[PDB]
């Protein structure tokens, strides 16, 4: 994911199969190569609680 | 006999009680911190009730008070009077206007006049009805205020017929009625003696004549008197032989405002207590039942104040101040706990106020209430446009539809034809490339002298250098010719009349539709200030206007030395301090222009201060304009914050700093050909057309010849002070016209004028 | 006219308490300080509730709160602006604001007058709260403190705490606990 | 002050203002501020061929009355006789 909506999408793929490991690699806008107009903290700061109510989501911070 | 009431102090709490009784939750009446409490115009009835109701009591007006009926009641605010306040002490006076025996019963029309501090504040109107069969005729009488009749004395027999009537009685019998317009403001007082036959008929009022200003002056009297009459001859005459001026003017289509839901109170005691109407009919079932009513009828007065509140809220946007007139017809009765959809539309105009009509029906869909209200327009200000935007055919559409328009144009077009030999309508209608006047027969020669007397005076060091405006027109000239490669509509001597005319016409149509607010403020931009003064203050005739304005243009055309091809040594530049730099302020443009003024010893001054930090206009020496336009271009590409360099360096330091910048650009334009062609800038635009540095100090010598021209056209008697005081914003001063020592001084300061200086100096000419 | 406009601009039906969301307490106070600049004492609006982080509640006369509402209306941005292709820093403030369901300006200078009068009344009936009698901490709305550790009248405090003083909700919920029980009005739209 | 006297005076003041207006500059910025702020006009109507003084008073509002207007909840309406007939004569569509 790279968007707040994108994250929310992953959360849905998560409910999809609650027993399956999903590595949500939250990248930021300050990464290398491909980009994003997005801040690295805001999205995560904002989605964290919801991301965390799904045990199958392995939250991984990247970029910078 | 007049009925005197009682003095009445409005307590803060009498208001609380009344508002809450009728259910008026307007904030103007609720005690708020740092505001005086206002009293509802409805409250007038609480004050006058005892003075008014007394009027139906005398023995000569014998009625069965238990069969009494309220027909109507209204309040009219006398103009200029502020609304009732919590502080006020109020004297009430109830005169009983008309008491007439009708087929069905006796009718009494009462008038209240609530005064405050000597002055009258508002009028209250109530009419009551004693039902029954009356022969009381000896105690019956009727006064009515006849509408104003206008009469256009066109012919010689017309004036003959009028002198034929004994009631037509003017001051100087020698008055030249021929070709004037008369108005007849009549009141007719009648007393009955029989069923249909009048006992006596009085009919009096002033006769007035229209002035060029369209003001009306008393010329004489209507004075009719007759016993054993049968009809009113005077009114009949004026009806058939005149037109009836009604001050109301409908809109095109009624405009719906809102449909609201109302309710009558559970009990009537609350209203009765605040109002002083202890009439048992409304409160005691056994009295209601004895009078054969449907029950304990709701106070017709409640519905009056209840509905009024709705009008107040939704039509006046809850600005108590705005409603200045309300009136109410009690169509049918209402019991307590009835629901009332009352609807409100905007129906027309009267004297700048919105005419509003309403109708209230009940649950059975029966009309119970109907009245109208006059409500003030939002604060209005009129600004009159100056030259530059004139288009061919401008406002010619309105000439085709509006009568007001035609009269304005035609009066003017005629004056122009008969004194200068051209049609301003033509020039406007089809922009003519050229136009020759021909000094034909006896009338041709009359015309040319009016051309020959065009003078441009120039007081230079005591000396008065006067020249003919029209050099060439002389005793041997057969014609003159105005020229313009584009079209004469854009040559100021015609442009100005055209503009003034279009505007004055348009405003007089608005005035005719009753759309001009009384307290509106006005201002004009250069030229438009004459149109503004004419439109709102009628300071001059329609002809006087086009005259002054036309000479003002001939004057401008001649005050500047000209070429062979008639070229100008001057011009105007329109600046935008914003475009130079976001840093470049007003003091910055002033500063810069004042330096390039002093430095080059040329002429640049700021002429138009139009929009702060955005639109300015400077005039003067074409060379000085080419410097400023370039000095400016430099400071922009240079990014020179002068507000910052003023802090860091000294006055003399930055002074010299741009004195250098000036001197490198000033060399460049002095070395340019004869009548330098101003070119565009980054924040400078040349005003194509203009050739005179007007609204600079340059035109200071051409003042006193115009200052006489104006005095010969703006007569003392047409300057009504109130039309200007506080409403008129000049251009010299930018402060609302006041005839005060204070104001007079500011004018001297901005101008230095003899007539003024003496006046300031000996202001104590106070006493006649 | 106001009610009309406030309605076609998706704001509430003008009342004495406006609630602004996603603005700094500092940010909010800024706009109000501006609005209040142009008004007389008796018409001014203040922060009533600091319900949370970027959640606040301004309060005053409805009309002057409507004025604040207008100054705000220009500073914001259409909700579906899609600033996803705009660099983060460069984007525009998106934020919510609406009038609240209440007839009176609580916690504002408008009510200070009724303060002394209410207390004078509370005495003329049996009512008072002795710190001896309260059995469990009652956290002060402003302090976050206990109302028992109080020199003067506990009654008089909670009167002035509802009528004049702001509610620093997070600081007044200083305590630590496993569980909070909401007995107050309004299901899931309520304080809990 | 005596009415006739007031006239006589007010008259010459009026004629003075008009005569010298010729030379002195046009203080329109100060003027607009008089009726915009001192008077708080809600309907400023321009009577002319095109809307020039209007867009003038419009810019002035954005440039200076941005905040004043908002707080004081005053809706201002700027109308040119040229283009805004409907709104001046109170005659709309449906």
UniProtKB/Swiss-Prot annotation, chain B:
Residues annotated as catalytic: 526
Location of cross-link Glycyl lysine isopeptide (Lys-Gly) (interchain with G-Cter in ubiquitin): 82
Region span, Malonyl/palmitoyl transferase: 345-563
Region (Dehydratase): 1-344
Lineage: superkingdom: Eukaryota
UniProt miscellaneous comment: Present with 91800 molecules/cell in log phase SD medium.
Name the record gives this protein: Fatty acid synthase subunit beta
Species assigned in the record: Saccharomyces cerevisiae (strain ATCC 204508 / S288c) (Baker's yeast)
Portion of the parent chain present: 1283 to 2050 of 2051
Swiss-Prot record, chain D:
Disulfide bonds: none
Position of the Glycyl lysine isopeptide (Lys-Gly) (interchain with G-Cter in ubiquitin) cross-link: 37
Record PTM Phosphoserine, positions in chain: 50
Top-level division of the source organism's lineage: Eukaryota
Post-translational modification: 4'-phosphopantetheine is transferred from CoA to a specific serine of the Acyl carrier domain by the C-terminal PPT domain. This modification is essential for activity because fatty acids are bound in thioester linkage to the sulfhydryl of the prosthetic group.
Misc. remarks from the entry: Present with 17000 molecules/cell in log phase SD medium.
Family named by the database record: Belongs to the thiolase-like superfamily. Fungal fatty acid synthetase subunit alpha family.
Record's function text: Fatty acid synthetase catalyzes the formation of long-chain fatty acids from acetyl-CoA, malonyl-CoA and NADPH. The alpha subunit contains domains for: acyl carrier protein, 3-oxoacyl-[acyl-carrier-protein] reductase, and 3-oxoacyl-[acyl-carrier-protein] synthase. This subunit coordinates the binding of the six beta subunits to the enzyme complex.
Subunit record text: [Alpha(6)beta(6)] hexamers of two multifunctional subunits (alpha and beta).
Name under which the protein is recorded: Fatty acid synthase subunit alpha
Gene name for this UniProt entry: FAS2
